[PDB]
Design a protein around this ligand. Structure first.
Ligand SMILES: [Zn+2]
Ligand SMILES: [Zn+2]
Ligand SMILES: [Zn+2]
Ligand SMILES: [Zn+2]
Lengths: 262, 263
């Protein structure tokens, strides 16, 4: 069991024999523009370069795509990844636009996804914006859906990749139901101009340990996209103030993290 | 259809040749006598009496409970509804509770409930509170889960009882998916002291109709318990203001509305 932080929410995961590339964003440093209608629009994306070359990321059994925002799936990854690569997608909408980009080996993943060997991937709901944001029609379609992944196995520990979501009840029900020993949160604190936080921040790391004390949080989706304000040093400082230093890991780009089972 | 507003979220729904009683609150006017030792016990609930006798309410094929909050399922209803009645519950814990209160003919609503007759009943996920409220683990369990209900059938228009939820995207996706001609909202505007509104209000009437302008809104869950701060008169005054007065139905207690697909 080896979870590795690449850049933003791009992750490499070894889990029960198989390997997964989660949300591959592989543009060069400052290739495309900053997000309009968000914080720090002057900063170009991505802010940081990749910690390792592209060929190392392609050596993977399947790509998993939580949603099709540009920081999770860019023009570079469309060019770079083979069209016969096994892409897991959130829904038919996502699969349809990936199909029109030239890809064809696609499995639209669903609430429960079982493998004979004992692997089980679950697809969990979130909310990529505030209750106020989704009252708007236009911004609703733009922020859209963005799932979280729960990987279960008998030989391995349960890990929960929560995805681009703010604190909503479906996140709470997912923690209670799956009781995950490891939790990966997108803790960038990305600010929309007129509706505020579209994903989690520092406070959501406290809230989750209050909800699930035995869990160990891995903070991702940070220092990469222009609107993500919450830096690594600030979260690390927030850890110390609440007495939760060893329970919050803040991996650097390229940092592999290992977790045993029994 | 024939939807009858009873009082609060209590209503009877004649749909596809079958009658249901959704969320029965059957206590008399100001009759909730639950007491431990309060110095200033509020004796306002229920604010209004039943507009019809209890006998008329029970002439029904099954009861449907969105959740077990007292304003949807009180002790009076737990006594008055017979134990051999078919009760449809939201999930396993509410079924267990209802079963341990003497009832034995209980069923749990799945996410989809396709019956051979052609009637389909979809269970919806809401949020009974703000995002902040559910960060509190104590108030998470207290407000808990509370499901919406869609009813689907040919020969009949599609109706969505949203239930005790504030505006979250699972509510928006339900309007986008099922596309109901009738959306029944719980517009009490009950508010938590520090964490803001716990159910829908006047604002949520307009935001739906912008999303789905064909639809007709039936207002409900108000002027029954004192904690619901929205008045009949205020919502009508709000509807006249934004030019939607004849699309916002605000029925009296006991009023029945007909909704036919053909005639
Ligand atoms: Zn996103
Ligand atoms: Zn993102
Ligand atoms: Zn309630
Ligand atoms: Zn209620």
């Amino acid at each position: 069991m080896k979870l590795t932080q690449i850049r933003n929410a791009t992750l490499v995961l070894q889990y029960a024999g198989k390997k997964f590339l989660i949300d591959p964003m592989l543009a060069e440093k400052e290739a495309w523009d900053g997000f309009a209608g968000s914080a720090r629009p002057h900063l170009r994306n991505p802010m940081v370069a990749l910690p390792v070359p592209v060929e190392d990321l392609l050596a993977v059994d399947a790509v998993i795509l939580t949603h099709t925002h540009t920081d999770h799936w860019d023009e570079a990854a469309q060019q770079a990844v083979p069209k016969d690569m096994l892409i897991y997608t959130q829904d038919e909408k996502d699969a349809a636009l990936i199909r029109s980009q030239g890809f064809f080996n696609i499995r639209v993943l669903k609430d429960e996804n079982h493998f004979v060997d004992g692997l089980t991937i679950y697809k969990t709901d979130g909310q990529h914006g505030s209750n106020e944001l989704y009252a708007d029609a236009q911004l609703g379609d733009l922020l859209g859906d963005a799932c979280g992944l729960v990987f279960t196995h008998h030989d391995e520990k349960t890990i929960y990749i929560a995805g681009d979501t703010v604190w909503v009840k479906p996140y709470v029900k997912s923690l209670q139901r799956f009781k995950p020993e490891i939790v990966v949160l997108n803790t960038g604190y990305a600010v929309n101009d007129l509706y505020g936080p579209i994903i989690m921040g520092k406070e959501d790391t406290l809230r989750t340990l209050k909800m699930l004390p035995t869990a160990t949080i891995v903070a991702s989706h940070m220092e990469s996209i222009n609107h993500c304000l919450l830096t690594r040093a600030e979260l690390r400082e927030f850890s110390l103030e609440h007495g939760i230093e060893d329970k919050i890991l803040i991996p650097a780009d390229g940092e592999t993290m290992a977790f045993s089972a029994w």
